[PDB]
């Protein structure tokens, strides 16, 4: 039950009690993901318009 690193200031204090010792995707790569999904939306809408044109 040890108290270590006791710090006191005007608005409070803090300390540590020990009870027992122990035993990314680049900017380019993101643009590709965003544009690849945008391209799948364009393709799906094209098949819809191609369907409606038929």
């Amino acid at each position: 039950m040890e108290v270590i690193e006791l710090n006191k200031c005007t608005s409070g204090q803090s300390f540590e009690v020990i009870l027992k010792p122990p035993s990314d995707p680049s900017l380019e790569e993101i643009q590709k993901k965003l544009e690849a999904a945008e391209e799948r939306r364009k393709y799906q809408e094209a098949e819809l318009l191609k369907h409606l044109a038929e």
Binding site: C9, G12, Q13, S14, E16, D24, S26, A37, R41
Partner: protein, 438 residues
């Protein structure tokens, strides 16, 4: 002094962000017009509260915050609310139609077209900071914006601010206050793509806040205003160290140092007490031992789970009010001889304690009664895995039938991203089991 920029995404993040900044102003003595009489340095200063507020030549204390929503109704409350004068228009960003609770729509379809605008507005706030620590990001799991656009913003912040820490306040989906059904999908999608980008996240389960509001506050059917005012108290308890003089959790990095020994396992459980109804005739003031003992009752946890059947990796005790170290240690001793507190063998069995003498501030007319002392415990338990298990099971039920998947594929998402995100959650669940179970 180092600055923190808060980012509020989606309806949940914006309304929660609104409640916190209201609370911050009442705590730091700031008026709705941005004026702060106690700030003797006009138009400048490197005080502790300056980590969250900047100052104009006219003495206005302006939050270091950005509000983002794909639809404007929630952010229009801020533009016209009580604290409209605090923010300037550049800080409030709104689209014209939301993501319809569709992750793919917020991340890809709409997110792609507004991500650069948000980064620009954030860059402006960053350009006012002499030493930016990082970002606090508020959002929901369930919303199409809160889930889908946040994960895109997190990826870009990791690129544009490599050496900056990013903490989250995330709202876990609860059926009692949700008319949606696809929220398990969004939660898992956003956790997968946000995992590697978030240093420390505080999950708040709406189900937990709902019961605390009915149980302790005697609200029959709580509103978002009720939930948010309680949630902003816990948020204030967690961010107080950054805004006040002190020596514990004085910068965003210290949160990971003290609460996250393993990177992926960065979801500390939060417990708060006491929550006393204001309508009560007058409540007996609880002691340090009583409120500390309450921190091990599931009824006051931000995520309902049983820590008695987990292992602790870290534990932080944040006190506010009339509390002295003597009483803390005295209570902690008693609890160890009465409670089930099993730590992992590769972590010390101890508690870091912070005390701020200023008692919890309460919004006038709110539901919470003014107490003389309160505490918030941050403990990294494997028991919080129960929440990942619950959420992952709901995902499996719908995904077996591919229910609602066409809504995501229709916005440009590949079905493979579903199973890819799910297998990541399976790996996350296995990590908790290797750390907690024998």
């Amino acid at each position: 002094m180092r600055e923190c920029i808060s980012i509020h995404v989606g309806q949940a993040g914006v309304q929660i962000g609104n409640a916190c900044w209201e609370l911050y102003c009442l705590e730091h003595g700031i008026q709705p017009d941005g004026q702060m009489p106690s700030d003797k340095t006009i138009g400048g200063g490197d005080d502790s509260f300056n980590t969250f507020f900047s100052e104009t030549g006219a003495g206005k204390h302006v939050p270091r915050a950005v509000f983002v929503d794909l639809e404007p109704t929630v952010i229009d409350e801020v533009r016209t609310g009580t604290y409209r004068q605090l923010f300037h228009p550049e800080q409030l960003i709104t689209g014209k139609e939301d993501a319809a609770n569709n992750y793919a729509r917020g991340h890809y379809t709409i997110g792609k077209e507004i991500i650069d605008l948000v980064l620009d507005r954030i860059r402006k706030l960053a350009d006012q900071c002499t030493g930016l620590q990082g970002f606090l990001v508020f959002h929901s799991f369930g919303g199409g914006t809160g889930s889908g656009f946040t994960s895109l913003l997190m990826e870009r912040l990791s690129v544009d601010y490599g050496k900056k820490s990013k903490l989250e306040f995330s709202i876990y989906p609860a059926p009692q206050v949700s008319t949606a059904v696809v929220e398990p999908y969004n939660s898992i999608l956003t956790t997968h793509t946000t995992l590697e980008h978030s240093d420390c996240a505080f999950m708040v389960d709406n189900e937990a806040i709902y019961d605390i509001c009915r149980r302790n506050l005697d609200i029959e059917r709580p509103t978002y205003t009720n939930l948010n005012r309680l949630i902003s108290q816990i948020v204030s308890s967690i961010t107080a160290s950054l805004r006040f003089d002190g020596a514990l959790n004085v910068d965003l990095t210290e949160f990971q140092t003290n609460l996250v020994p393993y990177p992926r396992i960065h979801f500390p459980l939060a417990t708060y007490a006491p929550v006393i109804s204001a309508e009560k005739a007058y409540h007996e003031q609880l002691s340090v031992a009583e409120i500390t003992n309450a921190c091990f009752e599931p009824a006051n946890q931000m995520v309902k789970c049983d820590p008695r059947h987990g292992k602790y990796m870290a534990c932080c005790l944040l006190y506010r009010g009339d509390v002295v170290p003597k009483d803390v240690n005295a209570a902690i001793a008693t609890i160890k001889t009465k409670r089930s507190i099993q730590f992992v063998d590769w972590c010390p069995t101890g508690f870091k304690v912070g005390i701020n003498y200023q008692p919890p501030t309460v919004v006038p007319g709110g539901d919470l009664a003014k107490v003389q002392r309160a505490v918030c415990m941050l403990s990294n338990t494997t028991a919080i895995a129960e929440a990942w298990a619950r959420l992952d099971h709901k995902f499996d039920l719908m995904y077996a039938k591919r229910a609602f998947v066409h809504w995501y594929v229709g916005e440009g998402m590949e079905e493979g991203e579903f199973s890819e995100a799910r297998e990541d959650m399976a790996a996350l669940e296995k990590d908790y089991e290797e750390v907690g179970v024998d």
